């Protein structure tokens, strides 16, 4: 599923993402925008280390979910990576919450640093009623 901007903003707020571990909703929106373009089925193979990024937040198979083919990987979210490709984003949100529970927080995603950090991210949530 490819979510529309405000549709996604409203869903995330309902899922308790606004202010989660100090992270505003607009930041989560900026991350989803740059990682997948709000697309839940997005997958990206990293030829360099044999891992794959899954779903709306492009969560990596090396530390977060299990896809069985990634070398020396863990499954911290305790989920099959398939769970991160559903139209229902409940599991992906639960896993994203787990990711930011580590010291790096939202910085764990390089895209966030490149395109969201220190920028005016208000545009991502404007007019959505959140």
End-to-end CA distance of the chain: 21
Nearer to Na ion, 73 or 89 (CB): 73
Known catalytic residue at 18 = no
- The radius of gyration computed from the CA coordinates of the chain, to the nearest angstrom, equals 14
Give the number of other Cβ atoms within 10 Å of residue 98's Cβ: 16
Among 73, 95, 99, 100, binds Na ion (CB under 5 A): 73
Pick the catalytic residue: 4, 7, 18, 35?
35
Residue ranges in 6-35 that form contacts with Na ion under rule CB under 5 A? none
Nearer to Na ion, 40 or 61 (CB): 61
Q: Is 51 in the site for Na ion (CB under 5 A)?
A: no
Pick the catalytic residue: 53, 67, 91, 120?
53
Nearest to 70, CA basis, from 60, 78, 55, 82 = 60
Known catalytic residue at 67 = no
Contact between 3 and 9 under an 8 Å Cβ cutoff? The reply is no
Among 61, 83, 93, 99, binds Na ion (CB under 5 A): 61
Rounded to a whole number of angstroms, the minimum distance from the CB of residue 122 to Na ion is 35
Nearest to 74, CA basis, from 61, 91, 85, 58 = 61
Nearer to Na ion, 24 or 75 (CB): 75
Instruction: Please tell me the distance from the alpha carbon of residue 69 to that of residue 85, in angstroms, as a whole number.
Output: 17
Per CB under 5 A, residues contacting Na ion are: 61, 66, 73, 75
- Residues known to be catalytic: 35, 53
């Amino acid at each position: 599923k490819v979510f529309e901007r405000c549709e996604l903003a409203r869903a995330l707020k309902r899922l308790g993402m606004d202010g989660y571990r100090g992270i505003s909703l607009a930041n989560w929106m900026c991350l989803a925008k740059w990682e997948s373009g709000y697309n839940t089925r997005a997958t990206n193979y990293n030829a360099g280390d044999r891992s794959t990024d899954y779903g709306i937040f492009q969560i990596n198979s090396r530390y977060w979910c299990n896809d069985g083919k990634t070398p020396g990987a863990v499954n911290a979210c305790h989920l099959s990576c398939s769970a991160l490709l559903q139209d229902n984003i409940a599991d992906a949100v639960a896993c994203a919450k787990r990711v930011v529970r580590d010291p790096q927080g939202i910085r764990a995603w390089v895209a966030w640093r490149n395109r969201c950090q220190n920028r005016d991210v208000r545009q991502y949530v404007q007019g959505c009623g959140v």
